[PDB]
């Protein structure tokens, strides 16, 4: 009923689509109305993924509102198998077919396709895309990932990276570099580059690594029991989080905590006399829960920013969010509308607000320095340049991206100061 203008999160089937588009060769066929293929635009433009996302909406119309929708789905699955030959295939429904129940899993079993089929139950009215992605990942792990022999080398699986994710593609590369640096080999990244063969091999690792808890906590928790696999908690955004993560995977694997920090310039580039106006600036962090928490641990501990606000939109992650908010002395804004956060920063007026694209836009509307750290973004925020957000190079990226608004502000402030004085 609530009047929504900018939903931070899409519907959950978008999340399932993100997981499917991320990995290779698993066709997430959908029972969706004609027109719901709009989601393909996100992956084809903002992520600029070349090939069409491996998803086949049934696209039913006023002609199709009865058992004809079931026949549409039947066709969609058998077609998708032959035409778009997968090794694994998803089923599910959007809002419309969620209301017009069609027994998606029953239909998929009715085809009885030789490739595994992952039945997806996606409540599309009370949950959101982060759920959708996590639930889809969990279902495909329980359908394809079975316990098996540990790799003789100590190995880990990165879980969490997901197509159309904030710098996920770069972050996998950075964390892979770091893990290999310690000595840990990455067994299979899922679900951003994995393949159903790789999901089958998931169990072979010694311990999963949670890069993005939003899309990976369910998978890691299930892996803890089914595959007897511990998973690291500290997402390594920023220098301090990187050190903790290094120590954590070191303990988990058994290898020394040596990690090469010769690319760490942020501790030096922020301790410099140049970065002294940055001390005690007010910041309003908003967006993804893990991103916000780690960004706060950076802002208040490695940059000198004073956190004056904090907020989130992952209700799923409200508990750690609130815990951290107490940690910094603030109160977490676990909301899902731009109105609340807008009023919050207007009351607070922090110097550097940062977060979702909305934070940037209503920063501009309020003329406040603006940065981007969280998930909801457009094509510009998806860069072609190597810009991870975790690891040491992630720390440097955070530094530059955060103080760029500040440098712009200082330079424009000067330029207005200069060439301008009382006329007489």
């Amino acid at each position: 009923m609530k009047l929504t203008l900018w939903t931070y999160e899409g519907p959950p089937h978008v999340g399932a689509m993100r997981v499917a588009t991320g990995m290779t060769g698993m066709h997430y066929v959908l029972h969706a109305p004609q027109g719901d293929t709009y989601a393909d635009l996100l992956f084809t433009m903002i992520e600029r993924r070349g090939k069409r996302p491996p998803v086949s909406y049934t696209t039913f119309q006023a002609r199709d509102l009865g058992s004809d929708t079931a026949e549409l789905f039947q066709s969609a699955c058998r077609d998708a198998y032959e035409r778009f030959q997968p090794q694994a295939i998803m089923v599910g429904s959007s809002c419309t077919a969620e209301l017009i129940q069609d027994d998606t899993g029953g239909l998929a079993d009715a085809l009885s396709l030789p490739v595994p089929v992952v039945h997806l139950e996606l409540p599309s009215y009370q949950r959101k895309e982060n759920f959708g992605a996590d639930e889809s990942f969990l279902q495909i792990c329980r359908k394809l990932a079975r316990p098996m022999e540990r790799t003789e080398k100590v190995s880990c699986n990165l879980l969490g990276p997901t197509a159309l994710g904030f710098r996920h593609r770069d972050d996998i590369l950075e964390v892979t570099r770091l893990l290999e640096g310690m000595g840990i080999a990455v067994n299979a990244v899922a679900p951003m580059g994995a393949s159903p063969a790789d999901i089958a091999r998931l169990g072979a690792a010694h311990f999963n690594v949670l890069l993005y808890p939003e899309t990976g906590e369910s998978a890691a928790r299930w892996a803890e029991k089914t595959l007897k696999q511990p998973y690291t908690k500290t997402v390594p955004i920023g220098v301090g989080a990187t050190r903790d993560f290094v120590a954590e995977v070191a303990a988990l694997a058994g290898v020394a905590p040596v990690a090469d920090d010769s690319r760490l310039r942020q501790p030096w580039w922020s301790a410099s006399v140049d970065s002294t106006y940055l001390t005690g600036k007010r910041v309003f962090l908003f967006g993804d829960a893990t991103h916000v928490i780690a960004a706060a641990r950076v802002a208040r501990d490695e940059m000198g920013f004073e956190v004056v606000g904090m907020g989130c939109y992952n209700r799923e992650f409200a508990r750690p969010m609130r815990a951290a908010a107490k940690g910094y002395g603030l109160e977490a804004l676990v909301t899902d509308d731009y109105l609340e956060v807008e009023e919050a920063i207007q009351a607070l007026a922090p110097e550097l607000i940062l977060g979702t694209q909305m934070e940037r836009h209503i920063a501009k509307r309020l003329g406040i320095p603006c940065a981007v750290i969280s998930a909801p973004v457009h094509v510009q925020d998806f860069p072609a340049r190597y810009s991870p957000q975790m690891g040491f190079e992630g720390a440097n990226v955070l530094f530059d991206t955060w103080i760029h608004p500040l440098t712009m502000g200082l330079e424009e402030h000067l330029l207005t100061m200069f060439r301008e004085d009382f006329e007489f």
């Binding site: 609530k2 009047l3 203008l5 519907p11």
Partner: protein, 400 residues
């Protein structure tokens, strides 16, 4: 005609994106689920960040398992929004796929809201769901919603039934008054002040090709349709102006004098953009239904050989005027599933591959120079002065 397949077109709500630009005193409350909310959020893009009149009230689980509660709550939220937005004078409830399936009485809801709101806010309802509509058709439905309400005028008036930008509609009006009398009344009223007097003798000038049902709704009032090829090039524009002129009565001399400057204005521009289009294969996929007009223009003026002009919704009584200038060579096939025309594109490799945005990037990676028709509705290229700009837009001869 999707062969039970993936029809890539959007649900009609994406038309609201530019409709809200046209009628600047009109709010659009969409009752779609989070899927439709995400669609508006995305397809609008930067619209969201400047207080757009895009209420996407999401119907949550509480709105499920109940019908009267749902539309009562809708009444409540509407009242709240006019409390936050007193400037609005026409509220546009729109039917969504979730609204259709739950059988929400959008008409009755709009009726009760109008009743308790009065003439100060003339809330209207229409349908823009993907279960019924397809992209542009939403604009058709939205204007058809106001069609019965518009004042009945039996006097001979002209209706500018189209949402062209000011730098387009104003030019059209200026030209029409330059040769004809021009009792032009733009149906997509800029404000409620300019309420057009639709009527029996108020023959309506159709200017946006995708408008199909519009025809029916206006003709119910008696408003006749001019069989004028659609104003989209040296042929469509000239024929449209000519037919509109003789429909109201204009001498050939006056027409020539009025259109002489535009004629030379656009001939040079179209030629200067056509050499990037000189003698190549085209392929229109069914995104938005402008393709027949685009083929009528581009194939004959810029020498773009017409392979297949796909169309999601073909029309006979409206498309006929520009259909006459259409060559028989292009395949008039309707909007199939993406696989069909995609395989056709792969087989008969076209130089320019106009399609939906979803296929634009893949076929671009698949060795097909692509132009997305999505740009067309926003970019003001629907009259004489912008005929060359349209050709330049279609050109896109990007080299590496």
């Amino acid at each position: 005609l999707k062969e039970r397949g993936q029809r890539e077109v959007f649900c009609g709500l994406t038309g609201i994106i530019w409709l809200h630009r046209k009628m600047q005193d009109a709010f659009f409350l969409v009752v779609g689920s989070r899927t439709c909310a995400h669609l508006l959020q995305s397809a609008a893009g930067v619209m969201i960040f400047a207080e757009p009149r895009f209420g996407t009230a999401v119907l949550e689980e509480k709105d499920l398992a109940g019908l009267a509660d749902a539309n009562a709550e809708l009444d409540r939220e509407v009242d709240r929004l006019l409390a936050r937005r007193p400037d609005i004078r026409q509220l546009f409830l729109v039917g969504s796929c979730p609204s259709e399936v739950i059988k929400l009485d959008l008409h009755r809801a709009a009726e009760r809201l109008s009743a308790h709101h009065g003439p100060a806010v003339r809330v209207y309802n229409f349908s823009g769901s993907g279960i019924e509509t397809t992209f542009t058709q939403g604009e058709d439905a939205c204007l058809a919603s106001i069609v019965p309400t518009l004042p009945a005028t039996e006097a001979r008036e002209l209706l500018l039934v189209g949402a062209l930008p000011d730098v387009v509609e104003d030019q059209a009006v200026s030209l029409l008054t330059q040769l004809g009398i021009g009792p032009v009344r733009c149906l997509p009223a800029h404000h409620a002040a300019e309420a057009p007097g639709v009527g029996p003798n108020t023959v309506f000038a159709l200017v946006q090709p995708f408008l199909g049902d519009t025809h029916g709704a206006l003709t119910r009032r008696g408003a006749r349709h001019i069989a004028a090829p659609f104003p989209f090039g040296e042929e469509g524009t000239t024929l449209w102006l000519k037919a509109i002129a003789d429909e109201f009565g204009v001498s050939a001399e006056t027409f020539e004098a009025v259109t002489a400057a535009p004629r030379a204005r656009a001939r040079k521009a179209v030629a200067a953009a056509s050499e990037g289009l000189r003698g190549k294969s085209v392929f229109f996929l069914p995104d938005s239904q402008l393709e027949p007009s685009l083929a009528r223009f581009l194939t004959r003026e810029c020498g773009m050989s017409a392979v297949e002009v796909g169309t999601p919704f073909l029309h006979r009584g409206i498309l006929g005027p520009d259909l006459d200038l259409l060559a028989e060579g292009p395949v008039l096939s309707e909007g199939q599933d993406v696989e069909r025309q995609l395989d056709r594109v792969r087989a008969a490799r076209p130089d320019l591959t106009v399609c939906g945005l979803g296929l634009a990037n893949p076929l671009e990676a698949e060795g097909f120079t692509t132009k997305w028709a999505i740009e067309l509705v926003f970019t003001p290229v629907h009259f004489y002065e912008q005929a060359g700009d349209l050709a330049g837009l279609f050109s896109r001869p990007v080299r590496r």
